[PDB]
Amino acid sequence: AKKKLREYQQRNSPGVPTGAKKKKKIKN
Amino acid sequence: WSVEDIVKGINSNLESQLQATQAARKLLSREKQPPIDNIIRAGLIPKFVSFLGKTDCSPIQFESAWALTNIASGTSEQTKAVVDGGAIPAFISLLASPHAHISEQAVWALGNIAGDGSAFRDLVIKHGAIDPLLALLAVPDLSTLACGYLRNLTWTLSNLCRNNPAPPLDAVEQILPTLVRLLHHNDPEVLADSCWAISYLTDGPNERIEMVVKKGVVPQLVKLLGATELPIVTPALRAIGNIVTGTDEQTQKVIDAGALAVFPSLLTNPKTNIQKEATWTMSNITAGRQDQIQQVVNHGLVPFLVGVLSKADFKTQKEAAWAITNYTSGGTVEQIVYLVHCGIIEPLMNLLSAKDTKIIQVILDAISNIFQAAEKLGETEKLSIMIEECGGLDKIEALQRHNESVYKASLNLIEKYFS
Numbered sequence: 001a002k003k004k005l006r007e008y009q010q011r012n013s014p015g016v017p018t019g020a021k022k023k024k025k026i027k028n
Numbered sequence: 029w030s031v032e033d034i035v036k037g038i039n040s041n042l043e044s045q046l047q048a049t050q051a052a053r054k055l056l057s058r059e060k061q062p063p064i065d066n067i068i069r070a071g072l073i074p075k076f077v078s079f080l081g082k083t084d085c086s087p088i089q090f091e092s093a094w095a096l097t098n099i100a101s102g103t104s105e106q107t108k109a110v111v112d113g114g115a116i117p118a119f120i121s122l123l124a125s126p127h128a129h130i131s132e133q134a135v136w137a138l139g140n141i142a143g144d145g146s147a148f149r150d151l152v153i154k155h156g157a158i159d160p161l162l163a164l165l166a167v168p169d170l171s172t173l174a175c176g177y178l179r180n181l182t183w184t185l186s187n188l189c190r191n192n193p194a195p196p197l198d199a200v201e202q203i204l205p206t207l208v209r210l211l212h213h214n215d216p217e218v219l220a221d222s223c224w225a226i227s228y229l230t231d232g233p234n235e236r237i238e239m240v241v242k243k244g245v246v247p248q249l250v251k252l253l254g255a256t257e258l259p260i261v262t263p264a265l266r267a268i269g270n271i272v273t274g275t276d277e278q279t280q281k282v283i284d285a286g287a288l289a290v291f292p293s294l295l296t297n298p299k300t301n302i303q304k305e306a307t308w309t310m311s312n313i314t315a316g317r318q319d320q321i322q323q324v325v326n327h328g329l330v331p332f333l334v335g336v337l338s339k340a341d342f343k344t345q346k347e348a349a350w351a352i353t354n355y356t357s358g359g360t361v362e363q364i365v366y367l368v369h370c371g372i373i374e375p376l377m378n379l380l381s382a383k384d385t386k387i388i389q390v391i392l393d394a395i396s397n398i399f400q401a402a403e404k405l406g407e408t409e410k411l412s413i414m415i416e417e418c419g420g421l422d423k424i425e426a427l428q429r430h431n432e433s434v435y436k437a438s439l440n441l442i443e444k445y446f447s
Contacts, residue, residue: 001315002272002273002274002312002315003273003311003312003350004231004232004270004273005231005266005269005270005273006231008305008308011343011346012304012343015301016301017262017266017301018224019183019186019187019190019220019221019224019263020143020183021143021144021187022100022101022102022140022143022144023101023136023139023140023183024057024098024101025057025094025097025098025101025136026057026059028129
């Protein structure tokens with residue numbers, strides 16, 4: 001059977017990579 | 029400055045206000061614990077939200093937009109404070125500014141708000157955010173727009189694709205065509221967040237996986253799968269990995285696009301997270317049809333999985349065991365005994381010293397179905413001796429007195445093949 005990402009992330013988290021959620025502006 | 033001096037100036041009230049709000053922005057950009065909570069407690073957010081509206085005074089717009097962007101980068105409650113002050117429609121209005129740096133700041137802030145979670149994401153969508161954001165990208169040449177500007181729009185777009193419940197189908201359908209274009213633009217950071225957006229959309233029911241795959245993106249996804257920039261490979265492999273959890277026809281599109289030729293580098297990639305997710309995706313390809321298993325065989329990937337099973341961090345060894353049990357459950361007799369010629373037996377037998385009840389059973393299922401293939405060819409006696417000589421029989425012998433379900437599975441191998 002195929003196993004979807006939730007089961008993989010549930011097996012392996014914390015630490016599974018993801019994109020940035022929030023960014024603080026220090027620049028400009 | 030102190031917060032108190034800022035309050036005298038915001039409430040002095042126009043030339044004085046900009047310096048104090050400007051002073052607030054500098055304070056909120058400070059490295060260590062900008063004092064977000066006190067600015068909210070002082071009641072300054074309603075003025076900042078008020079500040080987004082001085083179409084006359086662009087300077088107070090930009091500063092308040094910056095200060096608010098940086099309040100919304102904090103906790104969910106701090107983000108809540110910004111929304112509760114009315115910032116969403118004010119920011120949406122600001123996307124149309126003739127000043128590019130102000131339009132971007134509204135884009136950035138909206139990205140922070142949507143990134144907090146599914147409720148704020150859908151509320152931002154309900155306010156009509158998608159159309160003016162996409163309207164900004166409706167240029168013949170995406171290289172026309174400033175590079176830093178484009179990066180935020182892509183990032184902001186990706187947070188709108190993210191996260192129980194999923195985004196409304198209409199929003200994903202409406203944003204997606206601009207997403208495919210961005211997936212081909214030549215900037216490394218834009219590509220990464222394009223893959224991220226695509227990676228989000230492919231995690232779910234097969235109807236969502238199906239949707240991205242129609243747009244012809246899988247050949248390009250396999251291309252980024254082979255990029256040298258780790259920030260690109262990471263989301264590309266996640267997106268490909270999700271697609272191969274689907275049905276047999278979607279899985280055929282990834283193989284046919286050439287994805288498997290990249291996996292020799294990926295399954296030896298020194299970046300821990302890359303090697304494990306490549307092993308997991310292999311576990312879902314080896315859960316497929318027999319003609320797809322022989323194609324892993326044809327691409328030479330069995331030696332690479334024996335290698336990961338032999339030596340890798342422990343979590344991947346468990347991922348490879350699933351790839352192997354899946355292979356032995358669906359493969360032809362010849363493909364499974366080919367595993368034996370490639371050296372599958374020793375790293376499997378070595379891994380059975382582990383005490384986790386769960387993986388012991390995964391390994392034992394692979395061994396029994398493999399013996400049954402040996403039964404059909406008449407080679408069981410060669411294999412029984414092979415398992416014994418690398419120390420596997422002692423371990424198997426020892427699992428009868430070690431979860432009881434593991435123990436009864438181990439005895440069965442003993443009664444049938446080692447008596």
